[PDB]
């Protein structure tokens, strides 16, 4: 857990107007949720060789596919894994009005084959504390400009700092709940198609899952914080569903 065989290279471009392209295979836990039609509509992160964790607003069905090991989605072909889904575990407390408690667990039918390019993310401890102002990473195939309406072929990554509930409420006010964590407002934004992906904060050498892409600016405003599902607040549920399944 949380150590890519293949090492990320995070440059200063990762911090400005909607990050950069990833070193292929450098975020192994990064998966793409796809249709039967092969069309990417959300991301996810692998926590196991068996489970994927995602946002609940994504509407993942058992009919949908988890694609492990992809870089370039426009590849006539690369070495990926099209894993099937057998059971979907949508948080009972997910609030659809509010997008609060926005985590869903996908149990795979076909175990993923951990390779050099496919591995898992470390999940945090509930008591874990990731300080505001900590610079983290968000990865995905979400649009680069709201104005593109074409999702990128290659995985992107942005570096953004964490925010206090307190200083996010200045932008979202009362919408910000406890199962939410804010990040960005710095020159980089999560956007359509990034949903259910990771917000990784490195901890004691490992990259750890601190947020899930949830919601944010309807226009992918780089001066507004992006909201994520707060993993520390939902990890005992992850732990307990995993145990009973």
């Amino acid at each position: 857990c949380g150590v890519p065989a293949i090492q990320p290279v995070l440059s200063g471009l990762s911090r400005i107007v909607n990050g950069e392209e990833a070193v292929p295979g450098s975020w192994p836990w990064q998966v793409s949720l796809q249709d039967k039609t092969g069309f990417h509509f959300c991301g996810g992160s692998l926590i196991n060789e068996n489970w994927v964790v995602t946002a609940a607003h994504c509407g993942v069905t058992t009919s949908d596919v988890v694609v492990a090991g992809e870089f370039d989605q426009g590849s006539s072909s690369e070495k990926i894994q099209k894993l099937k889904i057998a059971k979907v575990f949508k948080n009972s407390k997910y609030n659809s009005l509010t997008i609060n408690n926005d985590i869903t667990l996908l149990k795979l039918s076909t175990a993923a084959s951990f390779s050099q390019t496919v591995s898992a993310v470390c999940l945090p401890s509930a008591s874990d504390d990731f300080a505001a102002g900590t610079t983290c990473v968000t990865t995905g195939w979400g649009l680069t400009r709201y104005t593109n309406a074409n999702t990128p072929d290659r995985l992107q990554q942005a570096s953004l700092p964490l925010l206090s509930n307190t200083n996010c409420k200045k932008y979202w006010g009362t919408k910000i709940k406890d199962a939410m964590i804010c990040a960005g407002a710095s020159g980089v934004s999560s956007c359509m198609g990034d949903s259910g992906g990771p917000l990784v904060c490195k901890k004691n050498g490992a990259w750890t899952l601190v947020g899930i892409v949830s919601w944010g600016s309807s226009t992918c405003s780089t001066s507004t914080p992006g909201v994520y599902a707060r993993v520390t607040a939902l990890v005992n549920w992850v732990q307990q569903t995993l145990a009973a399944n």
Binding site: F39, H40, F41, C42, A55, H57, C58, G59, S96, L97, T98, I99, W141, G142, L143, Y146, A149, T151, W172, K175, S190, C191, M192, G193, D194, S195, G196, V213, S214, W215, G216, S217, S218, T219, T224, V227
Partner: protein, 56 residues
């Protein structure tokens, strides 16, 4: 004169969900998701419907 289906927002939130689920508006435009089409109609004070889901 024609039409089909009105795009829905999360009113209880004033931002959107970040999923990619393009919609074809009755205007001839693609919207990354429905919530976008809604915020665009709100801002623009427009009344664009969803022609078909998926891209135009």
């Amino acid at each position: 004169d024609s039409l089909g289906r009105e795009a829905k927002c999360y009113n209880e939130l004033n931002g959107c969900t970040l999923e990619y689920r393009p919609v074809c508006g009755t205007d001839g435009d693609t919207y990354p998701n429905e919530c976008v089409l809604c915020f665009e109609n709100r801002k623009r004070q427009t009344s664009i419907l969803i022609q078909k889901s998926g891209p135009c």
